[PDB]
Each structure stands twice: as C-alpha cells, then as structure tokens.
Design a protein around this ligand. Structure first.
Ligand SMILES: [Zn+2]
Ligand SMILES: [Zn+2]
Ligand SMILES: [Zn+2]
Length: 178
C-alpha cells in the first residue's frame, strides 16, 4: 500500500485498502473509514465495482436525467466519491470550512456554502436527489466568484469548479459534447 493518504498526501494514521494500494486518513476517506470490515475496500474500489457489474452504466447520459435521480445507495456513493475528488485537490482548502465575508465593496452571499457542510449533509442523508448535492457544490463556487469580483482570488473558484465539473462528467458518465 501507499505510505501517504490518497486525499491530502500526508502520512499519519492510515487505513489501507485491501483491493488496491491506496491509503487514507480516517476522516479523509468519504464515508469515514468503517470501524471493522476485514477485508475493507475504499470508495475508488467500490465505484469500479459498480461500473464492472453494469458496463452499460458508462454509456453517455444527459445531465438533466442524472440530476433528477433519487439518492439510492449507488447515487449516494457516486456523490461521496465526487466530493472526495474535490478534497483531493489541495485548493479545496479554501472552500472546506465555513467562510466569512467582510471586504470593502462586496456583500456576502445570501446562502453561504462550504465543503464540510456538504460532507455533513451527505452523511446525514439530507439530499433526496442528485440535484440537491450538485446545486450545493456549484453554489460554493458561484458565491466565491460573486464575492471576489475582480480580485484575482476569484480564479481559485474557477479552478476548483473545473475539478468538480470534470469529475461530475466522469463519475456520472455524462455524454461527451463539443
Ligand atoms: Zn488525509
Ligand atoms: Zn481501493
Ligand atoms: Zn447490468
């Protein structure tokens, strides 16, 4: 197994996957690494299994159809993995914890949002459709772009949104377009 966490790239108290060489901090993995279970298979492995059991699940889909899906176990897992893929980027640090807004010439957003809030919401089964999760994720970046206006710091929102969107299209097998 790897000797660093797949998500944050640090050593520490790591839990190792039995079916692949990845390792994780307990609360870096999503869902948090399960207490017992030997063998244990990480989220990367669980997602690959879904694909392998239903190869057709990789044919192209329309985003509008994906968003209206109910949050049954497989879609729950897919959103957990998509959230984890965002945390895998170091620039996620800016969007992880609760933000505050006090900048001359800007007013904070009406509905603040952050990664750890989305994480809690998924853990607590608060989303009934994929759309709920995707809306909160996209709101994180939209709030940031609107608040930071012409400051160059707005680019961090564009960057992390791009990671989100590329991974959304991969995980949910969105039909490729120009
Ligand atoms: Zn970690
Ligand atoms: Zn694995
Ligand atoms: Zn099948």
């Amino acid at each position: 197994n790897s000797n660093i966490c797949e998500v944050c790239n640090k050593w520490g108290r790591l839990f190792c996957c039995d079916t692949c060489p990845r390792s994780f901090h307990e609360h870096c993995h999503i869902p948090s690494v399960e207490a017992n279970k030997n063998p244990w298979s990480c989220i990367f492995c669980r997602i690959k299994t879904i694909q392998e059991r239903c190869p057709e699940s990789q044919s192209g889909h329309q985003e509008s159809e994906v968003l209206m899906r109910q949050m049954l176990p497989e879609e729950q897992l897919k959103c957990e993995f998509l959230l984890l893929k965002v945390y895998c980027d170091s620039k996620s640090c800016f969007f992880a914890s609760e933000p505050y807004y006090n900048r001359e010439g800007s007013q904070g957003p009406q509905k603040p949002m952050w990664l750890n809030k989305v994480k809690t919401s998924l853990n607590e089964q608060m989303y009934t459709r994929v759309e709920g999760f995707v809306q909160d994720m996209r709101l994180i970046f939209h709030n940031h772009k609107e608040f930071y206006r012409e400051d160059k710091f707005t680019r961090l929102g564009i960057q992390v949104q791009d990671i989100f969107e590329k991974n959304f299209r991969n995980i949910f097998a969105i039909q490729e377009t120009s």
